[model samples]
Target chain A: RMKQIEDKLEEILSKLYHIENELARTKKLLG
Target chain B: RMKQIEDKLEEILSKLYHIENELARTKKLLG
Candidate 1:
């Protein structure tokens, strides 16, 4: 159970990293 | 410092909610 949550947390962190990258580009484009 | 991290996590979660909504729309559009 903890392992599943841990894995999902890591996956979410990875996804957030990619999302932040995309948001950076978007901020650059708009700002 | 820990509080800042927690705040970011919430922000990330909110962003992810939006992203998933967009993804669902895209998937249906493609399907």
Candidate 2:
């Protein structure tokens, strides 16, 4: 159970990393 | 049981909305 939790947590982490990378690469629009 | 799922799904939706808003507000960085 713990290992499964860690596995899922890591997947979430990688997605968060990719999201940050995307945020770093996108242009901001007018509010 | 199903209500709990719906509740969580809505929570997820709001989070996704915030993420999208954050993405919209971000500036591009280096590659």
Candidate 3:
């Protein structure tokens, strides 16, 4: 159970990193 | 603990929602 949650957390972190990159790109264009 | 993890998950989800809104706004500007 803990392992499953840990795996999911890692996946979420990876996706969040992608979103952060996209947001940075968008902000650059907005500026 | 599980409760602590659950609380953090809620926080992460809330922040993700905010990011989604920002992304949508940025896309509107780009269009």
Output the number of the DockQ-best candidate. 3
Q: Per-residue lDDT of B1-31 in model 2, one digit per residue for the tens?
A: 6566555555655676577567645542221
- Candidate 3 lDDT for residue A29: 83
Candidate 1 residue A2 Cα shift, in angstroms, is 0.9
Ranking by TM-score: 3, 1, 2
Candidate 2 or 1, higher lDDT: 1
The alpha-carbon lDDT assigned to residue A5 of candidate 1 equals: 51
Q: Can you list each candidate's DockQ? A: 0.10, 0.20, 0.39
Alpha carbon lDDT at B12, candidate 2: 57
Q: Pick the candidate with the highest lDDT.
A: 3
Local accuracy of candidate 1 as per-residue lDDT tens digits, B1-31: 6566666666767778788566555544544
The lowest-lDDT stretch of 10 consecutive residues in candidate 1 chain A is A22-31
After superposing candidate 3 on the true structure, give the runs of residues whose Cα lies further than 4 Å from its correct spot.
Answer: none
| Order of models, best lDDT first | 3, 1, 2
List the candidates' TM-scores in order. Answer: 0.49, 0.45, 0.63
Q: Global lDDT for candidate 2?
A: 0.57
